[PDB]
From Swiss-Prot, chain A:
It is found in: Mitochondrion inner membrane. It holds the Pfam family NADHdh_A3. This is NADH dehydrogenase [ubiquinone] 1 alpha subcomplex subunit 3. It is a single-pass membrane protein. The keyword Chaperone does not apply. Residues 52-80 are annotated as: Disordered. One of its GO terms (cellular component) is respiratory chain complex I. It comes from the Eukaryota. Its main location: mitochondrion. The chain crosses the membrane at residues 14-34.
From Swiss-Prot, chain B:
The chain holds residues 37 to 95 of 212 of the full protein. It is found in: Mitochondrion inner membrane. Transmembrane segments: none annotated. Core subunit of the mitochondrial membrane respiratory chain NADH dehydrogenase (Complex I) which catalyzes electron transfer from NADH through the respiratory chain, using ubiquinone as an electron acceptor. Essential for the catalytic activity and assembly of complex I. This is NADH dehydrogenase [ubiquinone] iron-sulfur protein 8, mitochondrial. Core subunit of respiratory chain NADH dehydrogenase (Complex I) which is composed of 45 different subunits. This is a component of the iron-sulfur (IP) fragment of the enzyme. Interacts with RAB5IF. It comes from Bos taurus. Belongs to the complex I 23 kDa subunit family.
């Protein structure tokens, strides 16, 4: 079968270039750790408005001042 | 006597197919062919300017 990938590429190298780009396209999102950053960037882009909550017992975290060390880690993008 | 033209098979190996598959797909012909042979416009045109200049003849 190892000649079939070289004795049709002497006759029609047209669709062979298509399968070579059809392949190596489905394969790569299962490979590089650059993906799931593509979902991590896409999650912390605020469209709507952040409504606040109310104190009742808890008090889990995040007081009235926003610039306190209160919220989660989305500040790795400015270092990126 | 004789002469044979267009009587030659291709090489049909691993090397020279890439030499031909660079031709069909990425056009090593048809630009080196006729994007250069045409231009080549940089010669002086040869036009007889007829009401004033006239052409050669013979006695
Ligand atoms: C089939 C597996 C697909 C997934 C492969 C994963 C990637 C692998 C990387 C490429 C490896 C090599 C691929 C083998 C190609 C063999 C096909 C072949 O030889 O064609 C025979 C025959 C050739 O028969 P033919 O003699 O008429 O040749 C004419 C070919 N043209 C038109 C180009 C001049 O081709 C076919 O039967 C299929 C043609 C339809 C192809 C539709 C393209 C799909 C578009 C992208 C999706």
């Amino acid at each position: 079968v190892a000649a079939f990938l070289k004795n049709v590429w002497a006759k029609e190298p047209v669709l062979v270039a298509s399968f070579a780009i059809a392949g190596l396209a489905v394969i790569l999102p299962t490979l590089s750790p650059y993906t799931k950053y593509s979902l991590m960037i896409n999650r912390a882009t605020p469209y709507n408005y952040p409504v606040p909550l109310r104190d009742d017992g808890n008090m889990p975290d995040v007081p009235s001042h926003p610039q306190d060390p209160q919220g989660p880690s989305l500040e790795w993008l400015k270092r990126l | 006597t004789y002469k044979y033209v267009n009587l030659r098979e291709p090489s049909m190996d691993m090397k020279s197919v890439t030499d031909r598959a660079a031709q069909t797909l990425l056009w090593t012909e048809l630009i080196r062919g006729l994007g250069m042979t045409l231009s080549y416009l940089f010669r002086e045109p040869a036009t007889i300017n007829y009401p004033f200049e006239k052409g050669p003849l013979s006695p």
